[PDB]
Design a protein around this ligand. Structure first.
Ligand SMILES: Nc1ncnc2c1ncn2[C@@H]1O[C@H](COP(=O)(O)OP(=O)(O)NP(=O)(O)O)[C@@H](O)[C@H]1O
Ligand SMILES: [Mg+2]
Ligand SMILES: [Mg+2]
Ligand SMILES: [Mg+2]
Ligand SMILES: [Mg+2]
Ligand SMILES: [Mg+2]
Lengths: 499, 510, 499, 504
């Protein structure tokens, strides 16, 4: 089932320095909770300053949904330590509150939306969330995940580009990465899916107790999870075609969202009633990215510069790491992304893209089932999952050797040897491990225990990159940038909204 | 420019009885106004009963906009007499109100004050009003007060028989779609002859070179029908929306698709606002009647059936011509000369070969319409084929068509007896050598002398005094009294039969 | 979800004359009714002679249920004109009676004493009537008044020669594809979204004030559990001729716990032919049936000659045709049957067959629901129905080009353009159009209104293929054959050798 | 609205090789500005040598208005790389100055004293600066600081030889007529001046931003509007016949102007214009597209046309592409190939002076409100009827057939891919250059937007290595161009007035 990538792997092995200088970033979301596991109804801890402007710590959907973001970085350990400083400082600055360490929340059935002050941008961001709330439900929006941001170094593109060609070849390369990701990225929830159970608050042969599926990996990625939009016809063959379909989705009115109404009794209910209010609403396992200029839209930035990096969005929170993600995951992603850059990925119509999802749903719902077979697209399932994983890992192993030869060491090769074991025994995967524990003490019980351990752990750990003066300097600089904005507001909200 | 139809005309001259039994109906709208020309703000007159259910008399968009509908009829004079009886009874049962005799109303200061047609509290009645609420929010109430006449026309079965099974209704449909394609190509002769709205109040408003008076009357020196221009209406055209007239299923699918397509323009309006519903939905067409159409294929519906359902089921039954302005020179807004001209022209449209046309070929036929609409009376105006450079002097094009219409008139006259259709040809062909004979030249002189306002007020008074004194000829007073009672009763029965509140009922109909 | 069929389509475009000479037949059933909609209790109209032996007109289950059958034909227009002649002649030879124009009846009470079809005193006749007595006693007579159209179809020899056990295997392939994808038929042409209460479940039925039940997005309740349906317990499969015939012969001798409780007799009156799951082979309910013209039981004919043609049985009555079917349906079935012969169909166990039913039931019960998704077999629903239909029609359109090139014109391509619009807009389907009419006037009002207008239309049309002499000649010939049969052992004794 | 070109296209599909050997050239103008966005007041950068004589790099109206010009070329990639070398070299040889990336300048006051392009002391150099003085006094300097891109285009002789010089001329006049009719598709897709500095100011429904920027919500190219680089229609110039064209043009040059006679010829001995006729010289006639033949020594544009006929056409309608560091990209060049071939194929009836003026009605709609939902277009001056999207899709049906023919002789599917990309702009005007740059200007202003683009493009182009021309080619051309100017300056030339009378 895995394509023949031998040609490209030989190329890579002749060009080991093509891979030097991979850039990465991480985003991790966590709900602030009280000791009994209920959702904290207090505001964004004052020590964090302005969620709207803060360089490293913000909120996602809810006022109580923290999100930490690491500055782009060439060093895995540096990035992971940075993320941990963010967690350490926050753990010691939120009273008795602790951070929920699971993807799926459990003590939620009326949740406060993220608050960003009174500026226009800050009211538009909250309004968007009101929109999502009304369209999808507040509950689904408290599900947590980790995003992994990744770019190959220029050396990679050079080793295969001058002037206008460069931005085009890099975009073609990332769209290829994206097509291969749709085809083979179910390997991620297989290994690291960590939500085989959901609370009642959220058709499928569920076992009841808390609801679970015996072989499930990542329900966060199922229909009951963070999802929504298959009618949009978005494809990943070509930069212009991609943006055209996405820009088109932005201008597509939805009847169902028109039925919600743009406003009801003085309270504005959503930005508009198109399929996507803004481009961020397009749910995706993986996303093409390019840092936007001030106020610039995601697709404008892409049209102007091409794809800059990619955002992998499929990771559940790692319940076994106090920061929700670990080095073993990051390194596997490097390997798998590089592999996705190397393998031939024919173009895919949107019905072919829907066919790639068949393997994902098998993995999401019953990935650990003994005897599970997978197919090529919609074709008859005939490839036993363990052999597919092992074929993939043969390739990843060659990538690991190259990465290790330039960095020094065997860190990547070790990762491969650890994770390929999960195909021989699914009981090694995050979801087998976490289900055992949720069946033992429930989602609530399990999450509270981890939350408590991780809080006591992170509260005692000295900072390593950031000093307490860096957080205080940024609390000041961030809260200031927000006032700088709130004053500078020419027109009033209702008018700025129109334009 | 006029195609060669000698082969079909020779066919017709050999089968004169193929035309025996043309069926017709008329609808005519008029605003109820006070002596001053302003819209009456009283309810639908009591003597007229329920606008919702009445057989002959209803309301269109506004509560002050009357509409009169004759039952399908094979006799022109009988149908026009019936129409006049409706006007006569109404004229004497509307208090001090009278009927506005022009397509174009005089100055209106606040379109948003115009009361929409009220149909009582039944769910069906509230849906009809909500439809109008939607039209108002989408296009504004003002343009909806512009009025016209619809001419409904069907050829007899004997026409098609002189030209089996499942094929019969398909051949009839293809014949009517042929009529429609020819109407698009050549229908501009209608506003040329009978357009009667060369002026518009500024309160209803371009780079058009309008002449202006101090009361706000805007006019174009050679215009025929501003009602049919982009200033005279508000909706998207079938033409503009992508709908074609080559094949029935194709036509029905485009229409049904427009009903199902959401609109960002209309979502911006919102569906509700302060607990007041503003539209039925936010799709391109709330319902099928919302489609702007100068000519419409029809089949009478059965209960539950949408207009396009009935077309799909039984094919095209008849066509509705919608391009006629109100005739300001008739108390009933329409006369025999017009009806007879349309008989000749529709029959000609059924005889002339009409190649299929794509959306853009259809859009091209409108080039000549726009020339006629805005300056049809300009000395030296030339027309062209579709979008090609204009090279055909209008007078000669009209003379050529009338040569054919004259042969159709000879046939219709030989079967009906007399010379009535032939006289109409001779009367009307003269308008091509003298545009000062057309309706629009006549009504422009009038409006220069006394404005839209003074012209309508003076005709409205004169016509009121004719109509309120003339004896009923077909319907008698007791027929109006009975239809009033029966219509009120049908409305009471619909109100009592509802079982679901409107909000709930609406969800299964929106 | 629609398999890739490009090799077979390329093969076909290279061999266009492979499709020249498709053969077809139509069967249409219709209840004889009075102007008030009630079931006529007169006998089989006299002008039609013997229902038992007549060549073109007969009865189905009920003496009042007419059935029209066209002789196998290679021309579509000819076949539909012939069927129409039969309707014409019948319309003007049944007093004030007319033909009910819908699949579902309205003015029939449950347990109503419906006269079973009567075939005279011959052993054969008494056996046909006894079969129906069995059906009546097993399933009730109400269900048996639901009517339908069957479409009979065979590819020419030219088809197989361009590619006898090859022909059987080809038709079994057709059958397997039909089970997988044939829900496309009730979607487009289902015309029974409402049911009278007589036929009454956990289905979310709506009910009108006048007492009619319906499902808002239903296509064909004739094909639902409440309709003309089941028996899957028999484990018949469609992989091999002998396997099929064996399962069927076995079914006829499998005893029924349930039907034994009915008994073979009460009070000197025989109640059923036997107490097995199937009294005869024709009792096996099926959306589609392998056929060979018999001399001989249906399975004997298949063993002797192999599959000669297939009978599509899923068509509801077309309420918009005076004859219950139109050219659009006929051409679509050509296209789709040819497509079924071209797409690869793996073999299927009886549980893989049971799984094909999931999409059928979805389409039957809510096929018009916005956002309906289908799945492969029993797996997660993930393919939006419009996208699947358009996927299929890309292939059908290529088959249509081929049929049009060898036939002249564009009639098949026109039908694709028309029917593909129903995937964009389900309100264009038969069931949407007929539901608007039924919600307003009822099954009863809608059927009466249509029946009245078709009666007037058909009475006025002249015959075109058949002459009155032919109906007269056939009445006489058929009555002769019946009495010649009655002349040619008493019944209870003959039955001991055939039950 | 789009004419039927079925027959011409069927002809082309059976003669694909009639198109092989298309020649092209680009000109792109850009203001030198400081990092704060103000107009540089330094002279033409030294490393560039003599603007008067340089082969590739020159000035337009102002001393700070750089202009880059590619030598005629058959290969698109090669022409764009050449253009890019010119920008690379220049960006690293102008101190801390950078290139303004937009058509409309900001931070330039109306009645700002803008230095005219300086060409030295020769007759030719003095003549060129004088013509610019004429322009400044006739139309004002400010408008002349608007920049654009010109696309120069010729079909191979191979194309005329499949369907002598008189027939090539007639063929380019047909291209010009169709270009007047349908060329508004260019500002629609690629216009990029929807906003305008206050400096340039009407009955137009302008929005003002708090920042203070004027814009029309649906505009595409205000550069092409009456407030931009525009107007002269009453000269009665027509494009039906070569000799009729030059006759009209030659007549306009001799037509006195009483408005310009009021400026005077001299004031305090200083000449203020070349003459007071409606056109000082042929190049003063504004036009969206121009017939060209390369001129010999002492030949006017029209002299060259009378001698050898039309050689190629110049499309003048392109705004600067704000999203390309060189102000133009391959997608635009390929579209114009397709479009210019289509203009050569489609029949174009002859048009009178006033029919040509009537073609401006559609241009002005597109210019002022081309991205307006539901915009309709008309034929000539007649009522708008045709939805803009439907018109673009019909055009692109034919362009796709041209594209297929060009791709088949070039290999690949690059032309077809462009058709697909741009037809999408008819379904969504938010894809167009003007929708995109307006978003950016509403958030950050013209100045803010231009500065950020100019800064990014400076850092980008200063790091890219030269590909076709090396530093040494620029040094050699610098020195050669300086030498050519010195030689013209040292020549024993005629008295200036006598020399004027004998020009053109
Ligand atoms: N036969 C041809 N076909 C296509 N392009 C040509 C041809 N001959 C010259 N060119 C191009 O035309 C352009 C000439 O530009 P330039 O020397 O600036 O003259 P110009 O356009 O007459 N001056 P301006 O007044 O600024 O328009 C170059 O880009 C040449 O590549
Ligand atoms: Mg992220
Ligand atoms: Mg009407
Ligand atoms: Mg006169
Ligand atoms: Mg049958
Ligand atoms: Mg130039």
């Amino acid at each position: 089932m895995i394509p023949d990538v031998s040609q490209a792997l030989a190329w890579l092995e002749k060009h080991p320095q093509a891979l030097k200088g991979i850039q990465r970033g991480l985003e991790r979301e966590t709900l602030r909770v009280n000791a009994d596991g209920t959702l904290a109804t207090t505001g964004h801890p004052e020590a964090l300053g302005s969620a709207l402007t803060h360089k490293w710590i913000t909120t996602d959907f809810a006022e109580a949904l923290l999100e930490f973001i690491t500055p782009v970085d060439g060093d895995i350990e540096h990035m992971l330590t940075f993320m941990r400083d963010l967690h350490r400082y926050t753990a010691r600055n939120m009273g008795d509150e602790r951070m929920w360490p699971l993807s799926m929340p459990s003590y939620i059935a009326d949740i406060e939306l993220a608050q960003y002050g009174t500026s226009n941008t800050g009211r538009f961001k909250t309004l968007y969330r009101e929109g999502l709330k009304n369209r999808y439900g507040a509950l689904m929006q408290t599900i947590s995940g980790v995003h992994y941001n990744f770019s190959l170094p220029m050396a990679f593109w050079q080793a295969k580009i001058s002037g206008a060609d460069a931005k085009e070849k890099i975009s073609a390369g990332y769209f290829r990465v994206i097509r291969n990701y749709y085809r083979f990225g179910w390997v991620i929830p297989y290994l690291f899916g960590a939500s085989p159970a959901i609370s009642s608050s959220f058709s499928l042969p569920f076992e009841k107790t808390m609801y679970y599926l015996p072989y499930a990996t990542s329900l966060r990625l199922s229909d009951l999870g963070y999802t929504n939009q298959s009618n949009l016809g978005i494809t990943f063959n070509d930069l212009y075609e991609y943006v055209a379909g996405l820009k088109q989705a932005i201008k597509t009115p939805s009847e169902e969202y028109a039925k919600i109404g743009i406003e009801k009794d003085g309270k504005r209910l959503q930005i508009n009633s198109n399929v996507l209010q803004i481009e961020n609403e397009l749910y995706a396992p993986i996303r093409p990215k390019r840092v936007t200029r001030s106020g610039e839209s995601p697709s404008d930035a892409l049209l102007r510069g091409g794809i800059e990096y990619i955002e992998v969005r499929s990771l559940d929170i790692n319940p076994f790491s106090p920061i929700g993600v670990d080095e073993q995951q990051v390194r596997f992603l490097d390997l798998f992304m590089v592999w996705c850059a190397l393998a031939d990925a024919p173009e895919m119509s949107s019905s072919e893209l829907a066919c790639t999802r068949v393997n994902w749903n098998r993995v999401i719902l019953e990935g650990r089932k003994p005897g599970l077979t997978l197919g090529i697209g919609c074709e008859t399932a005939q490839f036993p999952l363990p052999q597919v994983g092992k074929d993939l890992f043969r390739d990843l192993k060659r990538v690991a050797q190259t990465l290790d030869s330039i960095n020094g060491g065997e860190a990547y090769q070790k990762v491969c040897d650890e994770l390929v074991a999960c195909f021989d025994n699914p009981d090694l995967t995050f979801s087998a491990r976490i289900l055992r524990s949720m069946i033992d003490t429930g989602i609530g019980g399990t999450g509270k225990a981890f939350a408590e351990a991780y809080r006591n752990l992170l509260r005692e750990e000295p900072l390593e990159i950031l000093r307490e003066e860096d957080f205080v300097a940024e609390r000041e600089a961030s809260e200031r940038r927000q006032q700088e904005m709130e004053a500078a507001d020419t027109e009033p909200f209702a008018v700025w909204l129109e334009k």
